[PDB]
Design a protein around this nucleic acid. Structure first.
Ligand SMILES: NC(=[NH2+])NCCC[C@H](N)C(=O)O
Ligand SMILES: [Mg+2]
Ligand SMILES: [Mg+2]
Ligand SMILES: [Mg+2]
Ligand SMILES: [Mg+2]
Ligand SMILES: [Mg+2]
Ligand SMILES: [Mg+2]
Ligand SMILES: [Mg+2]
Ligand SMILES: [Mg+2]
Ligand SMILES: [Mg+2]
Ligand SMILES: [Mg+2]
Ligand SMILES: [Mg+2]
Ligand SMILES: [Mg+2]
Ligand SMILES: [Mg+2]
Ligand SMILES: [Mg+2]
Ligand SMILES: [Mg+2]
Ligand SMILES: [Mg+2]
Ligand SMILES: [Mg+2]
Ligand SMILES: [Mg+2]
Ligand SMILES: [Mg+2]
Ligand SMILES: [Mg+2]
Ligand SMILES: [Mg+2]
Ligand SMILES: [Mg+2]
Ligand SMILES: [Mg+2]
Ligand SMILES: [Mg+2]
Ligand SMILES: [Mg+2]
Ligand SMILES: [Mg+2]
Ligand SMILES: [Mg+2]
Ligand SMILES: [Mg+2]
Ligand SMILES: [Mg+2]
Ligand SMILES: [Mg+2]
Ligand SMILES: [Mg+2]
Ligand SMILES: [Mg+2]
Ligand SMILES: [Mg+2]
Ligand SMILES: [Mg+2]
Ligand SMILES: [Mg+2]
Ligand SMILES: [Mg+2]
Ligand SMILES: [Mg+2]
Ligand SMILES: [Mg+2]
Ligand SMILES: [Mg+2]
Ligand SMILES: [Mg+2]
Ligand SMILES: [Mg+2]
Ligand SMILES: [Mg+2]
Ligand SMILES: [Mg+2]
Ligand SMILES: [Mg+2]
Ligand SMILES: [Mg+2]
Ligand SMILES: [Mg+2]
Ligand SMILES: [Mg+2]
Ligand SMILES: [Mg+2]
Ligand SMILES: [Mg+2]
Ligand SMILES: [Mg+2]
Ligand SMILES: [Mg+2]
Ligand SMILES: [Mg+2]
Ligand SMILES: [Mg+2]
Ligand SMILES: [Mg+2]
Ligand SMILES: [Mg+2]
Ligand SMILES: [Mg+2]
Ligand SMILES: [Mg+2]
Ligand SMILES: [Mg+2]
Ligand SMILES: [Mg+2]
Ligand SMILES: [Mg+2]
Ligand SMILES: [Mg+2]
Ligand SMILES: [Mg+2]
Ligand SMILES: [Mg+2]
Ligand SMILES: [Mg+2]
Ligand SMILES: [Mg+2]
Ligand SMILES: [Mg+2]
Ligand SMILES: [Mg+2]
Ligand SMILES: [Mg+2]
Ligand SMILES: [Mg+2]
Ligand SMILES: [Mg+2]
Ligand SMILES: [Mg+2]
Ligand SMILES: [Mg+2]
Ligand SMILES: [Mg+2]
Ligand SMILES: [Mg+2]
Ligand SMILES: [Mg+2]
Ligand SMILES: [Mg+2]
Ligand SMILES: [Mg+2]
Ligand SMILES: [Mg+2]
Ligand SMILES: [Mg+2]
Ligand SMILES: [Mg+2]
Ligand SMILES: [Mg+2]
Ligand SMILES: [Mg+2]
Ligand SMILES: [Mg+2]
Ligand SMILES: [Mg+2]
Ligand SMILES: [Mg+2]
Ligand SMILES: [Mg+2]
Ligand SMILES: [Mg+2]
Ligand SMILES: [Mg+2]
Ligand SMILES: [Mg+2]
Ligand SMILES: [Mg+2]
Ligand SMILES: [Mg+2]
Ligand SMILES: [Mg+2]
Ligand SMILES: [Mg+2]
Ligand SMILES: [Mg+2]
Ligand SMILES: [Mg+2]
Ligand SMILES: [Mg+2]
Ligand SMILES: [Mg+2]
Ligand SMILES: [Mg+2]
Ligand SMILES: [Mg+2]
Ligand SMILES: [Mg+2]
Ligand SMILES: [Mg+2]
Ligand SMILES: [Mg+2]
Ligand SMILES: [Mg+2]
Ligand SMILES: [Mg+2]
Ligand SMILES: [Mg+2]
Ligand SMILES: [Mg+2]
Ligand SMILES: [Mg+2]
Ligand SMILES: [Mg+2]
Ligand SMILES: [Mg+2]
Ligand SMILES: [Mg+2]
Ligand SMILES: [Mg+2]
Ligand SMILES: [Mg+2]
Ligand SMILES: [Mg+2]
Ligand SMILES: [Mg+2]
Ligand SMILES: [Mg+2]
Ligand SMILES: [Mg+2]
Ligand SMILES: [Mg+2]
Ligand SMILES: [Mg+2]
Ligand SMILES: [Mg+2]
Ligand SMILES: [Mg+2]
Ligand SMILES: [Mg+2]
Ligand SMILES: [Mg+2]
Ligand SMILES: [Mg+2]
Ligand SMILES: [Mg+2]
Ligand SMILES: [Mg+2]
Ligand SMILES: [Mg+2]
Ligand SMILES: [Mg+2]
Ligand SMILES: [Mg+2]
Ligand SMILES: [Mg+2]
Ligand SMILES: [Mg+2]
Ligand SMILES: [Mg+2]
Ligand SMILES: [Mg+2]
Ligand SMILES: [Mg+2]
Ligand SMILES: [Mg+2]
Ligand SMILES: [Mg+2]
Ligand SMILES: [Mg+2]
Ligand SMILES: [Mg+2]
Ligand SMILES: [Mg+2]
Ligand SMILES: [Mg+2]
Ligand SMILES: [Mg+2]
Ligand SMILES: [Mg+2]
Ligand SMILES: [Mg+2]
Ligand SMILES: [Mg+2]
Ligand SMILES: [Mg+2]
Ligand SMILES: [Mg+2]
Ligand SMILES: [Mg+2]
Ligand SMILES: [Mg+2]
Ligand SMILES: [Mg+2]
Ligand SMILES: [Mg+2]
Ligand SMILES: [Mg+2]
Ligand SMILES: [Mg+2]
Ligand SMILES: [Mg+2]
Ligand SMILES: [Mg+2]
Ligand SMILES: [Mg+2]
Ligand SMILES: [Mg+2]
Ligand SMILES: [Mg+2]
Ligand SMILES: [Mg+2]
Ligand SMILES: [Mg+2]
Ligand SMILES: [Mg+2]
Ligand SMILES: [Mg+2]
Ligand SMILES: [Mg+2]
Ligand SMILES: [Mg+2]
Ligand SMILES: [Mg+2]
Ligand SMILES: [Mg+2]
Ligand SMILES: [Mg+2]
Ligand SMILES: [Mg+2]
Ligand SMILES: [Mg+2]
Ligand SMILES: [Mg+2]
Ligand SMILES: [Mg+2]
Ligand SMILES: [Mg+2]
Ligand SMILES: [Mg+2]
Ligand SMILES: [Mg+2]
Ligand SMILES: [Mg+2]
Ligand SMILES: [Mg+2]
Ligand SMILES: [Mg+2]
Ligand SMILES: [Mg+2]
Ligand SMILES: [Mg+2]
Ligand SMILES: [Mg+2]
Ligand SMILES: [Mg+2]
Ligand SMILES: [Mg+2]
Ligand SMILES: [Mg+2]
Ligand SMILES: [Mg+2]
Ligand SMILES: [Mg+2]
Ligand SMILES: [Mg+2]
Ligand SMILES: [Mg+2]
Ligand SMILES: [Mg+2]
Ligand SMILES: [Mg+2]
Ligand SMILES: [Mg+2]
Ligand SMILES: [Mg+2]
Ligand SMILES: [Mg+2]
Ligand SMILES: [Mg+2]
Ligand SMILES: [Mg+2]
Ligand SMILES: [Mg+2]
Ligand SMILES: [Mg+2]
Ligand SMILES: [Mg+2]
Ligand SMILES: [Mg+2]
Ligand SMILES: [Mg+2]
Ligand SMILES: [Mg+2]
Ligand SMILES: [Mg+2]
Ligand SMILES: [Mg+2]
Ligand SMILES: [Mg+2]
Ligand SMILES: [Mg+2]
Ligand SMILES: [Mg+2]
Ligand SMILES: [Mg+2]
Ligand SMILES: [Mg+2]
Ligand SMILES: [Mg+2]
Ligand SMILES: [Mg+2]
Ligand SMILES: [Mg+2]
Ligand SMILES: [Mg+2]
Ligand SMILES: [Mg+2]
Ligand SMILES: [Mg+2]
Ligand SMILES: [Mg+2]
Ligand SMILES: [Mg+2]
Ligand SMILES: [Mg+2]
Ligand SMILES: [Mg+2]
Ligand SMILES: [Mg+2]
Ligand SMILES: [Mg+2]
Ligand SMILES: [Mg+2]
Ligand SMILES: [Mg+2]
Ligand SMILES: [Mg+2]
Ligand SMILES: [Mg+2]
Ligand SMILES: [Mg+2]
Ligand SMILES: [Mg+2]
Ligand SMILES: [Mg+2]
Ligand SMILES: [Mg+2]
Ligand SMILES: [Mg+2]
Ligand SMILES: [Mg+2]
Ligand SMILES: [Mg+2]
Ligand SMILES: [Mg+2]
Ligand SMILES: [Mg+2]
Ligand SMILES: [Mg+2]
Ligand SMILES: [Mg+2]
Ligand SMILES: [Mg+2]
Ligand SMILES: [Mg+2]
Ligand SMILES: [Mg+2]
Ligand SMILES: [Mg+2]
Ligand SMILES: [Mg+2]
Ligand SMILES: [Mg+2]
Ligand SMILES: [Mg+2]
Ligand SMILES: [Mg+2]
Ligand SMILES: [Mg+2]
Ligand SMILES: [Mg+2]
Ligand SMILES: [Mg+2]
Ligand SMILES: [Mg+2]
Ligand SMILES: [Mg+2]
Ligand SMILES: [Mg+2]
Ligand SMILES: [Mg+2]
Ligand SMILES: [Mg+2]
Ligand SMILES: [Mg+2]
Ligand SMILES: [Mg+2]
Ligand SMILES: [Mg+2]
Ligand SMILES: [Mg+2]
Ligand SMILES: [Mg+2]
Ligand SMILES: [Mg+2]
Ligand SMILES: [Mg+2]
Ligand SMILES: [Mg+2]
Ligand SMILES: [Mg+2]
Ligand SMILES: [Mg+2]
Ligand SMILES: [Mg+2]
Ligand SMILES: [Mg+2]
Ligand SMILES: [Mg+2]
Ligand SMILES: [Mg+2]
Ligand SMILES: [Mg+2]
Ligand SMILES: [Mg+2]
Ligand SMILES: [Mg+2]
Ligand SMILES: [Mg+2]
Ligand SMILES: [Mg+2]
Ligand SMILES: [Mg+2]
Ligand SMILES: [Zn+2]
Lengths: 149, 49, 64, 107
RNA sequence: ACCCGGUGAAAUUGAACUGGCCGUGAAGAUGCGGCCUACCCGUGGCAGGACGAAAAGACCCCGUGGAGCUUUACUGCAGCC
RNA sequence: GGAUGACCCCAGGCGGUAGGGGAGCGUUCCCGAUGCCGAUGAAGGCCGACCCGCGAGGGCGGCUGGAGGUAAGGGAAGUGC
RNA sequence: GCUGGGGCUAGGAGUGAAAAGCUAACCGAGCCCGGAGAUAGCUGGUUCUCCCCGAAAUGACUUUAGGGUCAGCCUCAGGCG
RNA sequence: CUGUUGGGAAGCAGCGCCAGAGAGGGUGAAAGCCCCGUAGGCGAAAGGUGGGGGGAUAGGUGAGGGUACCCGAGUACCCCGUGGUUCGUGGAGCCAUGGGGGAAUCUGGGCGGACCACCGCCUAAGGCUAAGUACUCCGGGUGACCGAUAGCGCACCAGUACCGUGAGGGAAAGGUGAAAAGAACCCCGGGAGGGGAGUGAAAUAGAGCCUGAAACCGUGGGCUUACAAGCAGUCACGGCCCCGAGGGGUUGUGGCGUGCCUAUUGAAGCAUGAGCCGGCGACUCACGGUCGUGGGCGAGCUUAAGCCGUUGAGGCGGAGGCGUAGGGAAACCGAGUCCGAACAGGGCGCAGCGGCCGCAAAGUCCGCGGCCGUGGACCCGAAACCGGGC
RNA sequence: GGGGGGAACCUGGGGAACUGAAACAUCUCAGUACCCAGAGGAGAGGAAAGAGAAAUCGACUCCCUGAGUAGCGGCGAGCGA
């Protein structure tokens, strides 16, 4: 295998579309922009995601809902992330927040709550909270739920 | 990893010289043959492990 | 530079788990006295935005 | 700072390349700015001269044309061979050109 | 002005092998149809046509274009109380 | 059919502006290349009624020119008027 | 009254026996450089080849009407059949 | 080193040799070994630097107990007007301060987003402080940077010529040849210019100099043209010329035939643009998004800045990001959740293929491509607006 | 001792407008362009009357990140710790 054999698979590297390069190309002259109007201009239209030709927009006619907050901003409160029993299936012995963090299950800065999906395993699981069903299943499967403060 | 060896071979038109920390596929594919130290073979196996 | 989130949308709308866009029904902010209980009640629910408009609004929320 | 010339007026050199290759002669002049040497009876050209006080009867004269200095190799006064030059430091402790084939001074 | 010797521009110019009538044609045709007329090339003249040249109509409208001006338009500011 | 873009056979489609899609040509530069073509003549220029390609193009030959050019296969753009 | 020489007043400012006159051959706001590649929903222009498909000039809404957003109509990929 | 072809060898041939040096530039063409260099080493009396090393010096240093002396004033602090901050008057704190009022010395005071209490944090109204950061007039190194309309405005005697009262504006213009060997001398000519001679491998390389396209101008030749109606061609046939059952050139007659581009419902159009030729000339890039796609890995995927290495070598780095759970304004609950009195009803949500193996896949990372957002964002063009100058 | 100069860079004192908001005034552009003063090879900042919830951290500067998050906003365009 040498350099002259090194080759991308079909489709991996595709040719660009080049416009305004002649009649034969299919993209000459107007360069696929049609004739005149704002959209054909350099700079083009207002943001198509929002603007609607001057009329009150779809978005702006909908009502606001909920607490939007106010200065000085987000109120610090403990935050929970749920991990399901099924996600605990891979572990042995003792599971803790730091282990679930490391496994890629639990995000940092989040308190750990166990949720009921899947089957419980006889494990000592250490967490900041449990759903009712998670608690039931873990007891029944012979595990030891330890509740933090 | 032997500097003395690399210095002796480096000026040869048909030889490309590398320390094992520098092993890279462009240089492998460039050349018809691969020649390695047992020592170099070892850091290589560590790298791909 | 990275896209900015449109806060006007972020305050009016939510992207559901399957990527639908849900908003509060319009038309009960005021002038309600002569509106039937059926009107008030039904306008108190969320509704799913029509597909073409939802797609536009989602594009305004690149980090949700 | 200065043009490096491996040859000087008027050591004996071999003309190693060009129409006059193989020729041997003394170095009449050295012209660092063109990096060139004049070698006796080598690279002769026919030059037209006007009827003048300098050249009554006029006609043509013969001239030695410069040679690119790399075309020229000094001949060792010791072993009589064309050679590259080396530098040697004396006790003096000056530096001299010496022949590469044997070790003789070229001056 | 014209002719001979000397020197020698310009706007303009898709290319041209560039006629009349009656028609037709984006509605006023050297250029299409039918017919009529017409050997090839100039020089001095005339201005009817080439919708002749010049100037991206200055009228008129349009642009959520501009500028000067006005006021009991709006909102400010100087200044004065 | 044959098994796979191996080529053959039968059949049907193939006017086209805005525009969508597909497949290619060529230009500059990099890897290939410490290679290879090159003064027994590079690039560029001028011919050609010749060869290949649907075409964009590519060969080849004669002349000019006088020192550079650069393959199969890939990469990147100041890439075609 | 005219006029030489030496001076002063300038850009929303000067100066004006008043014409929006004049302020270095175009002044309803000088010139130069800079913001600056201002902005231009307007006009113009937009460059190699071949192959398949192939529109619209409608509706709703729009300080909108020669511009837009959505729908309709075209195209390509995957799926259904 | 030799031979060989050549004006010339470095090409080709034979036989060698160096290499910690086969980066690169030259030499008459294409050279590791001819030259300048390159690898590897060496070098400063003088001046500059010296953040590294060494040495001085300045400076540096207890414990309880009592005393309540001191601890930055038109200051804090409150009010009024305003600025800064993400904060546009907002529940509006904090930091700064133009005006008015105006303290206290630790049992003093400021802060933790009005305010109050509690609980903490901190020590205002004096000053200094390397390094890590920014820039590029200057020197150097290196380009999937330019190659004389490009690249700086300037490769060249350019911020020049020239334009402008001035501020200011602002060009064009590179190449003989290996070597000047740059053409003695003769000939026509006042000179210019040329013809010989001569140099050169080459002189349509002769200095108005490499190559030398195109428009454009001319000389010579072939065919053709003065009864003819034309977007200039095309199809056919015949004549003549040329190269040798074929082809090339030319065009007499006959047939057919409304330039190109733009803009338009519609143009040959008497609608736009273009004298002709050559060269310059317009859909890009960064970051983010969204689909598609080629791979990697897969309940996981992936690193950023840096750090080490390299000197066209790659690696380390898990901070962080996306994903693995949703629903609710939220408290919160969770395979559910929200509305509700509801165990009602509804909204938004929740569940691979083969013989442990393979395979496929959520997802995610990277490449590529379409399109979108932000920037001048396809290119060219205003009238104007503003600032500082003249 | 000062004065004046220096391509950018830096700090301070002043400080627009086009533009964007498909009009426009708050808002944006932007504390940008520009003017001025000063500094130096850098400049600024700097040793908590800090942060802000961790029973925590420990000068300042700079890069990554946090994060287009928190918030701000004719709650518009946008702005943005
Ligand atoms: N340690 C090494 N051999 N490094 C690679 C070679 C270094 C240098 N580029 C050479 O080829 O001579
Ligand atoms: Mg590409
Ligand atoms: Mg692209
Ligand atoms: Mg394509
Ligand atoms: Mg292309
Ligand atoms: Mg084309
Ligand atoms: Mg296409
Ligand atoms: Mg098309
Ligand atoms: Mg066109
Ligand atoms: Mg266009
Ligand atoms: Mg298009
Ligand atoms: Mg397109
Ligand atoms: Mg388009
Ligand atoms: Mg167009
Ligand atoms: Mg149109
Ligand atoms: Mg159109
Ligand atoms: Mg157009
Ligand atoms: Mg139109
Ligand atoms: Mg238009
Ligand atoms: Mg359009
Ligand atoms: Mg335009
Ligand atoms: Mg533009
Ligand atoms: Mg626009
Ligand atoms: Mg309206
Ligand atoms: Mg929030
Ligand atoms: Mg704060
Ligand atoms: Mg146990
Ligand atoms: Mg090498
Ligand atoms: Mg080597
Ligand atoms: Mg190699
Ligand atoms: Mg190498
Ligand atoms: Mg809002
Ligand atoms: Mg409502
Ligand atoms: Mg209400
Ligand atoms: Mg209310
Ligand atoms: Mg009623
Ligand atoms: Mg009722
Ligand atoms: Mg009622
Ligand atoms: Mg109700
Ligand atoms: Mg996020
Ligand atoms: Mg999420
Ligand atoms: Mg020397
Ligand atoms: Mg020789
Ligand atoms: Mg000899
Ligand atoms: Mg000496
Ligand atoms: Mg006469
Ligand atoms: Mg005359
Ligand atoms: Mg003609
Ligand atoms: Mg005629
Ligand atoms: Mg009629
Ligand atoms: Mg007409
Ligand atoms: Mg008529
Ligand atoms: Mg006629
Ligand atoms: Mg005709
Ligand atoms: Mg006709
Ligand atoms: Mg006719
Ligand atoms: Mg007629
Ligand atoms: Mg007729
Ligand atoms: Mg007639
Ligand atoms: Mg006449
Ligand atoms: Mg007339
Ligand atoms: Mg007349
Ligand atoms: Mg006419
Ligand atoms: Mg007329
Ligand atoms: Mg007329
Ligand atoms: Mg005209
Ligand atoms: Mg006129
Ligand atoms: Mg006009
Ligand atoms: Mg115009
Ligand atoms: Mg007009
Ligand atoms: Mg007009
Ligand atoms: Mg007028
Ligand atoms: Mg008028
Ligand atoms: Mg009108
Ligand atoms: Mg008007
Ligand atoms: Mg209006
Ligand atoms: Mg309008
Ligand atoms: Mg207006
Ligand atoms: Mg106005
Ligand atoms: Mg004005
Ligand atoms: Mg077709
Ligand atoms: Mg296709
Ligand atoms: Mg190609
Ligand atoms: Mg090309
Ligand atoms: Mg390059
Ligand atoms: Mg190479
Ligand atoms: Mg090469
Ligand atoms: Mg060869
Ligand atoms: Mg030849
Ligand atoms: Mg080339
Ligand atoms: Mg050809
Ligand atoms: Mg040739
Ligand atoms: Mg060369
Ligand atoms: Mg080529
Ligand atoms: Mg190549
Ligand atoms: Mg290739
Ligand atoms: Mg490759
Ligand atoms: Mg271009
Ligand atoms: Mg007087
Ligand atoms: Mg006077
Ligand atoms: Mg006077
Ligand atoms: Mg005077
Ligand atoms: Mg004045
Ligand atoms: Mg005065
Ligand atoms: Mg002035
Ligand atoms: Mg003015
Ligand atoms: Mg002004
Ligand atoms: Mg003004
Ligand atoms: Mg005035
Ligand atoms: Mg007067
Ligand atoms: Mg003037
Ligand atoms: Mg005047
Ligand atoms: Mg004005
Ligand atoms: Mg004037
Ligand atoms: Mg200026
Ligand atoms: Mg600007
Ligand atoms: Mg402009
Ligand atoms: Mg405007
Ligand atoms: Mg284009
Ligand atoms: Mg069709
Ligand atoms: Mg309609
Ligand atoms: Mg509507
Ligand atoms: Mg309407
Ligand atoms: Mg209107
Ligand atoms: Mg109308
Ligand atoms: Mg419009
Ligand atoms: Mg649509
Ligand atoms: Mg259909
Ligand atoms: Mg579709
Ligand atoms: Mg399909
Ligand atoms: Mg030769
Ligand atoms: Mg010979
Ligand atoms: Mg030889
Ligand atoms: Mg050999
Ligand atoms: Mg090397
Ligand atoms: Mg080399
Ligand atoms: Mg070399
Ligand atoms: Mg060679
Ligand atoms: Mg070569
Ligand atoms: Mg060499
Ligand atoms: Mg060295
Ligand atoms: Mg050295
Ligand atoms: Mg003490
Ligand atoms: Mg004590
Ligand atoms: Mg006291
Ligand atoms: Mg204090
Ligand atoms: Mg004091
Ligand atoms: Mg205050
Ligand atoms: Mg503020
Ligand atoms: Mg404030
Ligand atoms: Mg508020
Ligand atoms: Mg505040
Ligand atoms: Mg407080
Ligand atoms: Mg205060
Ligand atoms: Mg105050
Ligand atoms: Mg205290
Ligand atoms: Mg106190
Ligand atoms: Mg305070
Ligand atoms: Mg306070
Ligand atoms: Mg605090
Ligand atoms: Mg608080
Ligand atoms: Mg307290
Ligand atoms: Mg504190
Ligand atoms: Mg300080
Ligand atoms: Mg230090
Ligand atoms: Mg410092
Ligand atoms: Mg520093
Ligand atoms: Mg630097
Ligand atoms: Mg430099
Ligand atoms: Mg180039
Ligand atoms: Mg080059
Ligand atoms: Mg030039
Ligand atoms: Mg230039
Ligand atoms: Mg040239
Ligand atoms: Mg330039
Ligand atoms: Mg320069
Ligand atoms: Mg220039
Ligand atoms: Mg120039
Ligand atoms: Mg000059
Ligand atoms: Mg002037
Ligand atoms: Mg002057
Ligand atoms: Mg100027
Ligand atoms: Mg030359
Ligand atoms: Mg020369
Ligand atoms: Mg030569
Ligand atoms: Mg004479
Ligand atoms: Mg005579
Ligand atoms: Mg003469
Ligand atoms: Mg003559
Ligand atoms: Mg002569
Ligand atoms: Mg001769
Ligand atoms: Mg020859
Ligand atoms: Mg020749
Ligand atoms: Mg020639
Ligand atoms: Mg020549
Ligand atoms: Mg040459
Ligand atoms: Mg020439
Ligand atoms: Mg010529
Ligand atoms: Mg002739
Ligand atoms: Mg007749
Ligand atoms: Mg006849
Ligand atoms: Mg005919
Ligand atoms: Mg026939
Ligand atoms: Mg024939
Ligand atoms: Mg013919
Ligand atoms: Mg014929
Ligand atoms: Mg017939
Ligand atoms: Mg016609
Ligand atoms: Mg027609
Ligand atoms: Mg055309
Ligand atoms: Mg046009
Ligand atoms: Mg038009
Ligand atoms: Mg029209
Ligand atoms: Mg019309
Ligand atoms: Mg016509
Ligand atoms: Mg016409
Ligand atoms: Mg007209
Ligand atoms: Mg026309
Ligand atoms: Mg028009
Ligand atoms: Mg013209
Ligand atoms: Mg022409
Ligand atoms: Mg051209
Ligand atoms: Mg694009
Ligand atoms: Mg770009
Ligand atoms: Mg991009
Ligand atoms: Mg993409
Ligand atoms: Mg991707
Ligand atoms: Mg991977
Ligand atoms: Mg990883
Ligand atoms: Mg993030
Ligand atoms: Mg939520
Ligand atoms: Mg409730
Ligand atoms: Mg439910
Ligand atoms: Mg359901
Ligand atoms: Mg897989
Ligand atoms: Mg994947
Ligand atoms: Mg898109
Ligand atoms: Mg921009
Ligand atoms: Mg711009
Ligand atoms: Mg752009
Ligand atoms: Mg764009
Ligand atoms: Mg003006
Ligand atoms: Mg304005
Ligand atoms: Mg104005
Ligand atoms: Mg104004
Ligand atoms: Mg001013
Ligand atoms: Mg001073
Ligand atoms: Mg100074
Ligand atoms: Mg400041
Ligand atoms: Mg100051
Ligand atoms: Mg300020
Ligand atoms: Mg400032
Ligand atoms: Mg101002
Ligand atoms: Mg404004
Ligand atoms: Mg703007
Ligand atoms: Mg803007
Ligand atoms: Mg905008
Ligand atoms: Mg606006
Ligand atoms: Mg606008
Ligand atoms: Mg306006
Ligand atoms: Mg504005
Ligand atoms: Mg601002
Ligand atoms: Mg600036
Ligand atoms: Mg200064
Ligand atoms: Mg520094
Ligand atoms: Mg400092
Ligand atoms: Mg302190
Ligand atoms: Mg985050
Ligand atoms: Mg701001
Ligand atoms: Zn010797």
């Amino acid at each position: 295998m040498k350099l002259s054999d090194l080759r991308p698979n079909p489709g991996a590297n595709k040719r660009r579309k080049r416009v305004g390069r002649g009649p034969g190309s299919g993209h000459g002259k107007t360069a696929t922009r049609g004739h005149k109007g704002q959209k054909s201009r350099s700079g083009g239209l207002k943001d198509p995601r929002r603007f609607e030709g001057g009329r009150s927009t779809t978005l702006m006619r909908l009502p606001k809902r909920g607490m939007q907050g106010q200065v000085p901003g987000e109120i610090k409160r403990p935050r929970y992330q749920g991990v399901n029993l099924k996600d605990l299936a891979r572990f042995e012995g003792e599971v803790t927040p730091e282990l679930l963090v490391r496994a890629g299950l639990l995000k940092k800065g989040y308190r750990l709550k166990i949720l009921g999906e899947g089957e419980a395993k006889p494990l000592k699981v250490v967490a900041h909270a449990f759903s009712k069903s998670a608690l039931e299943k873990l007891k029944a499967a012979g595990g030891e739920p330890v509740l933090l403060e | 990893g032997n500097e003395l060896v690399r210095r002796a071979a480096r000026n040869l038109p048909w030889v490309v010289t590398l320390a094992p920390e520098g092993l890279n596929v462009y240089d492998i594919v460039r050349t018809e043959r691969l020649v390695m130290d047992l020592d170099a073979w070892e850091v290589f196996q560590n790298r791909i492990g | 530079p990275k896209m900015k989130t449109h806060k006007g949308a972020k305050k009016r709308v939510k992207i559901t788990a399957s990527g639908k866009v849900v908003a509060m029904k319009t038309g009960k902010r005021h002038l309600n006295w002569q509106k039937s209980g059926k009107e008030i009640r039904q306008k108190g629910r969320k509704f799913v935005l029509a597909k073409p408009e939802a797609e536009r609004i989602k594009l305004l929320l690149p980090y949700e | 700072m200065r043009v490096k010339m491996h040859v000087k007026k008027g050591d004996t050199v071999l003309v190693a390349s060009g129409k006059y290759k193989g020729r041997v002669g003394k170095v009449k002049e050295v012209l660092p700015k063109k990096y060139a040497v004049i070698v006796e009876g080598v690279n002769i050209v026919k030059k037209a001269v006007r009827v003048s006080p300098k050249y009554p009867q006029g006609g043509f004269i013969e001239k030695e044309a410069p040679l690119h200095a790399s075309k020229v190799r000094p001949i060792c006064p010791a072993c009589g061979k064309p050679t590259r030059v080396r530098k040697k430091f004396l006790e003096n402790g000056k530096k001299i050109r010496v022949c590469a084939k044997c070790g003789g001074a070229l001056d």
